Design an enzyme around this catalytic site. Structure first.
Site: not given
Ligand SMILES: NC(=O)c1ccc[n+]([C@@H]2O[C@H](COP(=O)([O-])OP(=O)(O)OC[C@H]3O[C@@H](n4cnc5c(N)ncnc54)[C@H](O)[C@@H]3O)[C@@H](O)[C@H]2O)c1
Ligand SMILES: NC(=O)c1ccc[n+]([C@@H]2O[C@H](COP(=O)([O-])OP(=O)(O)OC[C@H]3O[C@@H](n4cnc5c(N)ncnc54)[C@H](O)[C@@H]3O)[C@@H](O)[C@H]2O)c1
Lengths: 312, 312
Positions: B150, B177
């Site tokens: 953000d 957030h």
């Molecule tokens: N804080 C922020 O500002 C912000 C911004 C965008 C997204 N996010 C969040 O961050 C996360 C990451 O999304 P992304 O684009 O990398 O998605 P993605 O699907 O590309 O990556 C997620 C990863 O999590 C792994 N995973 C799933 N369950 C698991 C478990 N039990 N143990 C270990 N690994 C596990 C998957 O295998 C995958 O590689 C999402 O939850 C998304 O909502 C946060």
């Protein structure tokens, strides 16, 4: 200073666009192109990063918008692996993609320095070269096969073995970019001394590094993050050199004096117009000369393969 | 200084690991973990980059080897989107992943600072807190919700609008957030005044920055690269503060005095044990004070939702 990336939506592409967005000098421009629909979004994702670098994405069958006014074009488009295709298939598909993209480049930005990352490099810069000639815009000083990945893996492996600081080792690598065409000049690494057994082992690890990654990702893909890092280094070296910086030396795969093969990877001095001077590979050790002579045939077939693809 | 990344094979994870591999100080160690079997190869890929940062990757259902000795744990595991799943589906999946992972953290590395990236951060950090409490190792100074995204988005939009260099703007963002809980304190941006209209526009855009990336990806993708970038800056801030550096300030979602809500994002002074001081949000504008009170009830429920998740 406008840099274009073809195949931006891909693994190597995103890691490269990411690093370039945060490293290119200020005022610099970055355009991304890929046939994947998601490409304009990748650009949007990167535009939220606060650096002085404009960025845009485009999709579709026409990459003109991305190529217009470009000074540097890095091509990482292609295919790494897909279920059902074998050795021949990958080449069959990547050759066509390179042919098309270099083609569009020839008509849109014929004066740009072209870094080709798409494999197999030994054969793909040949295709690229032939495509440029048929258009009347070929300039062997501005066509490069990106082989920087070999250089950094070498730096890494050598540092690890001789217990040196990773960033203090710069191993020149010549030849081609595949199996036995990759030749690290371990005899020209200041400070460190090598054992014949270590030259044999290291050399082997360097030539197989890519494969080492693939087996680790268990069919999940090839090196993308390290290649992205490697391409970034090459990208910035070009930009620096294209902006008047002095003494920018980099090992790449270009068309030089056919003393070994039409295209050969050797130390290059970069400048305002791409390659400024192809430098001598210098002194080689017995092991180095032997590894060299024993691969010329292979490199020539890779090149031959490429030329035959264009001229039929 | 060992930093662990859980979910290292995802879109955010790979960009994060890449950025950390090349930017963590020399001597640092980086261990990646994810359920994806490709994970150890991701580490091998990254190990070929010449930086004095050791790296190992793991897969499977036990994060222990990746967590042993960890000083910093960054969690980005979870589901960005899957066909057939709606709002509540994603939440349950992500809530359960953060629960399982924090539990392992509690068992192996209870004294490490935890940075949660998984969304929805407003609820997920609450869940983590409860998991750490029930295990009896909770320390409110070592648990943070990463909101840096953000911040950098705000910095970019503000400079663009008032014609400043992207790198010289630093907008403090407080609250939560997501959606209406994201409050950029534009009134505190030095040497820059805004129109009740500008503020209205910038504020709504900053809050919808993500959606902006999603729509640009024809609905099949989310802000991954800018997130990796934001998480990199956060992580590097924590490492620097843990190494004893002074003056490191960062806005993060933490538990403090319930002046507005149990958990609240606000500027923080980071130190050797995590949060060292919770700085005041300072003076708010009319619009700001008004937006703040207007979202408090939403933030409070987001929080309630996380506490009730880990008790049924
Ligand atoms: N804080 C922020 O500002 C912000 C911004 C965008 C997204 N996010 C969040 O961050 C996360 C990451 O999304 P992304 O684009 O990398 O998605 P993605 O699907 O590309 O990556 C997620 C990863 O999590 C792994 N995973 C799933 N369950 C698991 C478990 N039990 N143990 C270990 N690994 C596990 C998957 O295998 C995958 O590689 C999402 O939850 C998304 O909502 C946060
Ligand atoms: N030179 C090196 O050291 C080195 C190291 C590894 C891989 N490579 C090669 O680089 C290429 C990149 O692989 P990757 O991992 O990024 O694969 P990838 O499949 O993840 O990415 C390739 C991208 O190419 C795009 N693309 C396909 N056809 C296109 C076209 N006609 N025009 C534009 N874009 C197009 C795809 O949509 C995709 O996003 C491969 O050919 C690989 O073998 C080179």
């Amino acid at each position: 200073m406008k840099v274009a990336v073809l195949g931006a939506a891909g693994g190597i592409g995103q890691a490269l666009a990411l690093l370039l967005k945060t490293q290119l000098p200020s005022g610099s421009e970055l355009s991304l192109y890929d046939i994947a629909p998601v490409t304009p979004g990748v650009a949007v994702d990167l535009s939220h990063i606060p650096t002085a670098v404009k960025i845009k994405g485009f999709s579709g069958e026409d990459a003109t918008p991305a190529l217009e006014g470009a000074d540097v074009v890095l091509i990482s488009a292609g295919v790494a692996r897909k279920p059902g295709m074998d050795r021949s298939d990958l080449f069959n598909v990547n050759a066509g993609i390179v042919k098309n993209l270099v083609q569009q480049v020839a008509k849109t930005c014929p004066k740009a320095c072209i870094g080709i990352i798409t494999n197999p490099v030994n054969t793909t810069v040949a295709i690229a070269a032939e495509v440029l000639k048929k258009a009347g815009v070929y300039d062997k000083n501005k066509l490069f096969g990106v082989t920087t990945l070999d250089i950094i893996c070498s730096n890494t492996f050598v540092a690890e073995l001789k217990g040196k600081q990773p960033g203090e080792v710069e191993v020149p690598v010549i030849g081609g970019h595949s199996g036995v065409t990759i030749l690290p000049l371990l005899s020209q690494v200041p400070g460190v001394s090598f054992t014949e057994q270590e030259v044999a082992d290291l050399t082997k690890r360097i030539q197989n590094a890519g494969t080492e990654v693939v087996e680790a990702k268990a069919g999940g893909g090839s090196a993308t993050l390290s290649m992205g890092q490697a391409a970034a280094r090459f990208g910035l070296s070009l930009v620096r050199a294209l902006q008047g910086e002095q003494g920018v030396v980099e090992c790449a795969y270009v068309e030089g004096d056919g003393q070994y093969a039409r295209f050969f990877s050797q130390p290059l001095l970069l400048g305002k117009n791409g390659v400024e001077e192809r430098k001598s590979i210098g002194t080689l050790s017995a092991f180095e000369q032997n590894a060299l002579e024993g691969m010329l045939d292979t490199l020539k077939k890779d090149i031959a393969l490429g030329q035959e693809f264009v001229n039929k």
